[PDB]
Amino acid sequence: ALHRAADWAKSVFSSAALGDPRRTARLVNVAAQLAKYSGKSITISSEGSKAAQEGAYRFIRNPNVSAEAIRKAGAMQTVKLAQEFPELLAIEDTTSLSYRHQVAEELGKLGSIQDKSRGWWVHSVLLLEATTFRTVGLLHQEWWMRPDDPADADEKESGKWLAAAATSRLRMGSMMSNVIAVCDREADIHAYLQDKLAHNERFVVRSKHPRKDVESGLYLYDHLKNQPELGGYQISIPQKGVVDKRGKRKNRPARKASLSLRSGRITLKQGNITLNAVLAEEINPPKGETPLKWLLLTSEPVESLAQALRVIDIYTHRWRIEEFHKAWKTGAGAERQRMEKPDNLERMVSILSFVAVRLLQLRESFTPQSAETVLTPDECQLLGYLDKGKRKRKEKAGSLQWAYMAIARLGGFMDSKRTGIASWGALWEGWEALQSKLDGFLAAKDLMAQGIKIG
Amino acid sequence: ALHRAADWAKSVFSSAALGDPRRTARLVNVAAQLAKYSGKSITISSEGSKAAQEGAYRFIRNPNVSAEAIRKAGAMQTVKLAQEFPELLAIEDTTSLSYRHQVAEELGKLGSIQDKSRGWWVHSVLLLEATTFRTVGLLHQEWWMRPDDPADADEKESGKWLAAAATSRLRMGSMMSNVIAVCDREADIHAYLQDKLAHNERFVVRSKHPRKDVESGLYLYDHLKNQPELGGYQISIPQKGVVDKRGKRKNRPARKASLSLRSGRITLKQGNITLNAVLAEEINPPKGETPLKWLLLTSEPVESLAQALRVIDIYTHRWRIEEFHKAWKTGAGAERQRMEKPDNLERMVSILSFVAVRLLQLRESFTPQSAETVLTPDECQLLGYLDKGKRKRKEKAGSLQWAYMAIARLGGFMDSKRTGIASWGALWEGWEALQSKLDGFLAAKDLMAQGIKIG
DNA sequence: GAGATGTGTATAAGAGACAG
DNA sequence: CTGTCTCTTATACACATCTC
DNA sequence: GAGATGTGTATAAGAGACAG
DNA sequence: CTGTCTCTTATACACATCTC
Ligand SMILES: [Mn+2]
Ligand SMILES: [Mn+2]
Ligand SMILES: [Mn+2]
Ligand SMILES: [Mn+2]
């Protein structure tokens, strides 16, 4: 359980069909060093190793390596791990990778045709287990450049959703039935909803456009407001800093929001498709605040306050893909790379997508047992030494809850908002520190184990 | 020689007259943690220490702490260290500290009155020893905000140079005679040159404006072109990436530049002051390249090709203050701080000026003996373990030249341009890594020294 | 089998970045 | 303002690996 | 001497940042 | 798009330190 990075890389890319085993091999080593030195330049991850550095750069530049094949490999590993869960969540969303150095000119449009910043549009599908909600891994990804003139686009971007569904359906095979897609408003596309339904595929999409109900003859919102109040729930909206359109600074104070919840069956005109819907609307919202609300369409049953709370709960996790994105950028450093050719940059950033998931997964592994479960006796001992006189009586002596706060404490976590949760980023610094320290801890050991004055 | 940070902070700020010993004390601890965690947030530097974090923030916010007094303290330490060198270089230049968060509005103007980015203008005087050219430390600093309307400025910014000279003359006292000021073109101000001369103060300033010579009746450049060619020298201009006004990308290839050198005495109209001058002009410059040239005014003698090469050499180091600036920002993170009040931000960034010099000094300490001279036996051993099988036959077994490349190699240095020199930044990562590892190395030791299974 | 493609070592140098 | 390096890309040689 | 100012611990929350 | 935390700032209490 030490140099996980190395074992990790192997389990993820060992099946990579790069057309040549040597390529597949190099892929696994490149990944391992990147994973070990998360968010660091290839150079640093090489550990002064010229043959390594040269091996890496040669790989992301090798005209024989399909960035798709790489991505494909990582996905297959996800399918494999998926085989052990009863219910899976497939978060689906899009993000952009933006660059401003020479290679930008050969990249697609992200904003205004005159905008210097250009890059790629990526549509990913991150898998989770609907039980404890842990990140299984990346199931699919679609990369594409947006032309300056839409009249040149080979296809409408909106079809991405149907694209994702297609590949997802192909890779997960008989496990699709255990999958529940989760997408934001932009997914409100009857051509999508129709598809999923045609395949008995489960899903949970948020409503954007006002639609009508065949029977009710009303707008979904108006038809659901009539259904009996199944009950409700509450959420604590945390305080944060905000930035208005003007560019100034507005504060969003904390406040507990009470919500009313309803549910029912709707039917849309096109394809005359039928499904259930849920409408969650805030309760007595503050004067200077917009009344919180959600209206989700889905195949999942919602006849009971519990079955509906399940839908609200599932959709609440869609935000995981947002954290994935931050991990892919600020984390693994996708937008920090400076390759000078499209294919090259794609090859690097493609590997980093997986090196981005791992950061998430790392924090989750230390989140609910004992430390000996994930940590090795050596590092577990060192962490204990380092964390000496810093643990709260709230945590056991050597529990999986202690290691969390100990590793996190290395990362600098001071629980400023006293919430207990530490950012995956602070938990990573800790892991990185602990491991770094483990080098010296194991070094002193190796020398004393062969007889040598260490002080 | 271990937790230098701690001893360091003490030697620099222990004399700080913050009006209360407790304040002075806190100052030293705050510095020590910042120095230990260079370029990191106060939080991280606190090592999970609530009483520390709270102590730091309380300090940079304490209405009783004069940011000047802090700076003053660090300067006095410089004067002290200066006492051991025959000849000192006082590089003088200005830089700006720019911020874009709310506190900006209360800060001075850096650009256009409408510009969001605002902050401070700082005029520093960094001391060096004219022999080996090591960084002694910060001798003076002037902080000031530029008003939106120049009609409100209490004084002309141009007088800063005379300001710096005044304080420098006051703190260095009888050691001013061993000092040589070094300033770029913007210092071409007869009111300055006149001052220094009036105080028998030495200096080396680059020429900007065309001036005439009382005798020669010519322009300095034209009067020096007549003097006999004292000889010359060569310099290797290193390849780099450049950015044109248009914003594109132009390459500046490497090339050895041959220069012709002359010298003579000039005399300006105002105050009818007299001094020596040196004119170094390139030789057979490339078609698409501007003919390199320097014309420096100074009190230092230049009658011989050696005495003149000394002036060219001295002025060549003025660029050290440019590295200081990068160290103050990208390094210590001056522009990364987010204090919400002017005085507060000043107090933090003021401390960081010194925590910025140390990064420079650190790289210099490992630059030309043996490692045992700077490194402790413990860390020296660990570095050797870590650097096992990575040293070139070019470096001794355990020399002060080996540690350099070993520590640097930890930092990732791969000598891409094969120049041998490593950035102070890469040498810092190494030092940081080594020390981090030293924690585990010393931990395993402490436990085995008391009998405990370490594997 | 005959002809590429990757590995380690070396040598050079364009692109980038941050500070002028 | 005479910059200082680090990140990326190639090329070449002697072998070691693979593909068609 | 009488009256502040800093230290450690605790409790809360506005500002910032990066991704929507 | 129902965000998630980390960086900065205060306040209060019981003492420990300092200043005028
Ligand atoms: Mn979206
Ligand atoms: Mn200047
Ligand atoms: Mn400058
Ligand atoms: Mn999104």
PDB file of C-alpha atoms (C1' of nucleotides) and ligand atoms in Angstrom, chain B residues 92-95 184 318-319 321-322 325, chain C residues 19-20, chain D residues 1, ligand 3:
ATOM      1  CA  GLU B  92      19.003  50.379  -6.104  1.00  0.00           C
ATOM      2  CA  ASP B  93      15.769  50.039  -7.996  1.00  0.00           C
ATOM      3  CA  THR B  94      12.014  50.241  -7.820  1.00  0.00           C
ATOM      4  CA  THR B  95       9.202  47.736  -8.226  1.00  0.00           C
ATOM      5  CA  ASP B 184      19.729  51.826 -14.021  1.00  0.00           C
ATOM      6  CA  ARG B 318      22.549  45.457 -10.780  1.00  0.00           C
ATOM      7  CA  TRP B 319      20.236  42.785 -12.125  1.00  0.00           C
ATOM      8  CA  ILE B 321      17.627  43.385  -7.490  1.00  0.00           C
ATOM      9  CA  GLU B 322      15.517  42.093 -10.367  1.00  0.00           C
ATOM     10  CA  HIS B 325      11.826  41.238  -6.931  1.00  0.00           C
TER      11      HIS B 325
ATOM     12  C1'  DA C  19      10.786  40.717 -13.749  1.00  0.00           C
ATOM     13  C1'  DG C  20      12.456  44.193 -16.182  1.00  0.00           C
TER      14       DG C  20
ATOM     15  C1'  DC D   1      16.245  46.348 -18.981  1.00  0.00           C
TER      16       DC D   1
HETATM   17 MN    MN G   3      13.502  46.976 -12.133  1.00  0.00          MN
END
